[PDB]
Amino acid sequence: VMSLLGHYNNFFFAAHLLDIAMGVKTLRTILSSVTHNGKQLVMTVGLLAVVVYLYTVVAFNFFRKFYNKSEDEDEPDMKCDDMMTCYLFHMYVGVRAGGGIGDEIEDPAGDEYELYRVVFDITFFFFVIVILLAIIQGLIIDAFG
Amino acid sequence: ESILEYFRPYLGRIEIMGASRRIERIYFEISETNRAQWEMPQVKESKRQFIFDVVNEGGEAEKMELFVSFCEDTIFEMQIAAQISEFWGELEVQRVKFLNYLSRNFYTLRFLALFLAFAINFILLFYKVSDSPPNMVYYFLEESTGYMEPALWCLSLLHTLVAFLCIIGYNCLKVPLVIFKREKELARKLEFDGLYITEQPGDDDVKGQWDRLVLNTPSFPSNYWDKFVKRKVLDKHGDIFGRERIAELLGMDLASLEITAHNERKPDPPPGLLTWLMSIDVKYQIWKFGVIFTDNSFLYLGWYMVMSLLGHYNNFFFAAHLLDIAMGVKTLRTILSSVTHNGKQLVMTVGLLAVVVYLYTVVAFNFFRKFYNKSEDEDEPDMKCDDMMTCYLFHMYVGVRAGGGIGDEIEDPAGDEYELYRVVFDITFFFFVIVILLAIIQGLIIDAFGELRDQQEQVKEDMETKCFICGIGSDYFDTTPHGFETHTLEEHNLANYMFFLMYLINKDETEHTGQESYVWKMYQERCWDFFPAGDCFRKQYEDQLS
Amino acid sequence: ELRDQQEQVKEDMETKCFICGIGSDYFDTTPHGFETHTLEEHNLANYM
Ligand SMILES: Nc1ncnc2c1ncn2[C@@H]1O[C@H](COP(=O)(O)OP(=O)(O)OP(=O)(O)O)[C@@H](O)[C@H]1O
Ligand SMILES: Nc1ncnc2c1ncn2[C@@H]1O[C@H](COP(=O)(O)OP(=O)(O)OP(=O)(O)O)[C@@H](O)[C@H]1O
Ligand SMILES: Cn1c(=O)c2c(ncn2C)n(C)c1=O
């Protein structure tokens, strides 16, 4: 099917590069280590979605003004004025950030919620970034075993 | 051949040590009801859990102790399941139908509550805030369908009701096992240890200090198979430590026991509701509530109640019910079990993290103080390390979370008399706090996956290589083809020992055969010599070829 | 490393006698044979 569709659009022949994964044996074993605990990996990213949403429900209610992504004071761009876009912001930026969510939002210094936001960002970093991605790395680490 | 094939399921053979230390084989009948209720899947799950607990958590001398304890509470489970199987009299019969239905469908109600939590949170994914009506904000469930707010309100009511039914179903299904375990342990400790007669328990042992409430209650051995543990304690420790003291401690009436020995009228004087208010035992009920309200599972379900109720106060409180999957689906339970296996190690590691980051704070405040500038406005400098509290806060909040060390979040140390000192400072911060002390955090759970690895592999291997009862390795049995398969399907089968205990209990005491009376007397005496240990029929008779 | 060290020590205590070195696969032929052997026959506290 991909060979035929490659005549419709020439870039469809790029999908045939994955044939090496079903080809050379060592790539088969590397992918077999990745896919040995595939159900565990899927449930781990499901837990990731759940905990990130649990951080979203507590960022919307309390830490709402901090999610500013606009330097233009005329047109603020609150990214957590709505559940859908706040959850999208957390899943897209906070998970991929090197630190937690604390490096992608407003500085919590000089505020009545300073300590609360410090706890918020530190626990986000500790549970979502260093723990819940170490599980993702550890499933395939153990699969090589 | 036809007779044997028809009675193949009901013929159970076991082997006991017997008198003169000769392994003897015993044949008996398993009723269809016993076999069916034993093959019921909940009992299968309980059996696998018990097998893991024995093989993994250890115990070689107490293995038969633990096996027989498993036998007792499994028999209690099958009694409970048989009980729950599908004006005042009308109320009582409708009530017991309701409780039995809840107890049967407890797990489906748990799944239903999880599904409702997901639905409510999916609705909450459309919440939005505006200052205008749908300095003071307004939360409205922005939606295009037009039915979503009524759906939310109906689903909230349904969720609270389902959670209530989960509480009631748990209380009527799994609580009797907890009570049975507690009273069984108390009876054994009273009769064979005298933990309240001769050897009082410690002050910090809250379990031992709490059990004193139930000693003198008239209904102590309820949800327990024997009811004469009080009389056995009186006959055992009465003549040493004092019979009258035994009576006072156990709430016993010495004359009344002897009069109920010879005459025991059994009427039902009060027919009304007032008998349920009068015959209730307040002290025993207080003890029972103390037992359940400390159980982990019931406290979790009670917190499920509390969050369900608070969700009506604020709808976002229903998000806390999403964590129910962690106590729900088994694979998430195992992932969290790897995380929590080394929980103390993780907590001490982050304690060491706090200590070393503070040790960097005391040396950044004294020397590298001017560098902690976070203000480009030269008019108003914002020194973040002019105070211990804010400098430690800066280090813990920014320096730990930075991709590099603290060196990428402060002033450039180039062109300064402390250039080399700050380079050493940032490099050692990166090397000790970032790459080492977070690798320990990752490594504890990395190694915990190896923990659960080797536990499951060890359990499965131990089942594969050695018999659970006799302990003889399969390298002996497999000499004959399928020798170990035969040994653990016919000769020594723990399901057959299940069925033997059940059959002894069911059979009339005057009708026991000689071997059954032998096994029965050491079941009551609690002497596990009859389990074949280190020997079997095949090993016993080799010259005669079994 | 520390994993396998603690596990090896505990396993070695569980499977073989510290003094005589005879494995528990010999003693456990008699019920509680290894327990008896390391509580009565060969006990390092008794050699103390
Ligand atoms: N005395 C014993 N009684 C029962 N099983 C024993 C005994 N000794 C060893 N075993 C091993 O226990 C294992 C139990 O696995 P088995 O296949 O019999 O369980 P199952 O019927 O699938 O159980 P479940 O329904 O709990 O999953 C068997 O492979 C058997 O070799
Ligand atoms: N000759 C021996 N002397 C003592 N112990 C032995 C000997 N051979 C093997 N062992 C094993 O040593 C183990 C020591 O554990 P044990 O439970 O006796 O220690 P303990 O009394 O708890 O010690 P401690 O107070 O040091 O913690 C026992 O499980 C026993 O099987
Ligand atoms: C050991 N044991 C039990 O385990 C038991 C019992 N009756 C019920 N059970 C469960 N009896 C009479 C008994 O002696």
Ligand SMILES: [Ca+2]
């Ligand atoms: Ca008889």
Ligand SMILES: [Zn+2]
């Ligand atoms: Zn056997």
Ligand SMILES: [Zn+2]
């Ligand atoms: Zn020895």
